[PDB]
Amino acid sequence: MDCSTNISPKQGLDKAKYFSGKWYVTHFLDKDPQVTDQYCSSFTPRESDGTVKEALYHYNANKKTSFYNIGEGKLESSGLQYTAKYKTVDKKKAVLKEADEKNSYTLTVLEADDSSALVHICLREGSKDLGDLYTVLTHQKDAEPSAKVKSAVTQAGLQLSQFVGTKDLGCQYDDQFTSL
Ligand code: HEM
């Protein structure tokens, strides 16, 4: 199961609405049924003159393990979209492993407003794709997304009823790490 070839960013989106503060994933849809562990995620993306750099956190809800990353790449000219390389870091943002240039993720913004966003992520590890991942984002953990963002979900051809909500998973976040 490859990522979809029919994902594009919403035109007209204000990048300022996306590159703000920290995001928490409130809801996710992973199209590959083979993927079984559920994660919580939070991240803080920043942009300067077309370069994106972001600090990312995952917590595996089933195992109570976590990992940290720093991603970096360039904004596409065509819309709010980037393909990032990523390194592995500790909680103090020291590098553990430099980026493997055979791996990347492509993040496409589908909607963003002051409180909420919807993004699509295609993670690739060499040959292999992870399958489509859709994440509904809010700035406050366990808040509901806006009506505008919920509309974006339907308009992406999805149903919110199918998403996993993270607020009931027993997440632990490292809010020190995502506060820049
Ligand atoms: C709750 C939402 C999310 C879930 C369920 C999820 C799920 C996963 C899973 C299952 C893996 C491991 C893949 C493997 O074992 O190789 C993974 C890794 C990864 N994810 Fe997430 N993810 C989420 C959000 C995101 C976000 C928002 C980003 C980027 C902004 C992202 C970027 C990455 C990266 C960079 C890796 C590392 C791949 C590696 O270690 O080489 N994820 N994610």
CATH of the domain at 61: 2.40.128.20
Beta-strand relationship, 116-125 and 95-97: unpaired
- Experiment type: X-ray
Distance CA 51, CA 48 (A): 5
Q: Convert 91-121 to b/e letters by CB count within 10 Å (16 or more is b).
A: eeeeeeeebeeeebbbbbbbbbbebbbbbbb
| CA 161 centroid distance within chain | 19
The protein residue whose alpha carbon is closest to atom 5 in ligand 1 is: 39
Domain extent at residue 107:
1-180
| Residue the block writes with tokens 């020190």 | 176
Distance 102 CA to ligand 1 centre (A): 16
Sign of the C-alpha dihedral, residues 155, 136, 88, 65? negative
| Resolution given for this structure, in angstroms | 1.4
Short-list 170, 108, 102, CA closest to 135: 108
Q: Which residues are annotated as a binding site for heme?
A: 58
Distance CA 41, CA 60 (A): 9
- Domain tally, the chain: 1
Give the C-alpha distances (Å, rounded to integers) separating 75 from 106, 133, 144.
10, 20, 28
Q: Convert 32-63 to b/e letters by CB count within 10 Å (16 or more is b).
A: eeeeeeebbbbbbbebeeeebebbbbbbebee
| Residue the block writes with tokens 């007209």 | 12
CB atoms inside a 10 Å sphere around CB 164: 15
Distance CA 160, CA 151 (A): 10
The protein residue whose alpha carbon is closest to atom 29 in ligand 1 is: 56
Short-list 161, 154, 149, CA closest to 116: 149
The protein residue whose alpha carbon is closest to atom 36 in ligand 1 is: 123
Distance CA 107, CA 51 (A): 13
Tell me which residues have their CB closer than 6 angstroms to ligand 1: 25, 28, 30, 35, 37, 39-41, 43, 56, 58, 69, 86, 103, 105, 107, 121, 123, 125, 130, 135, 166
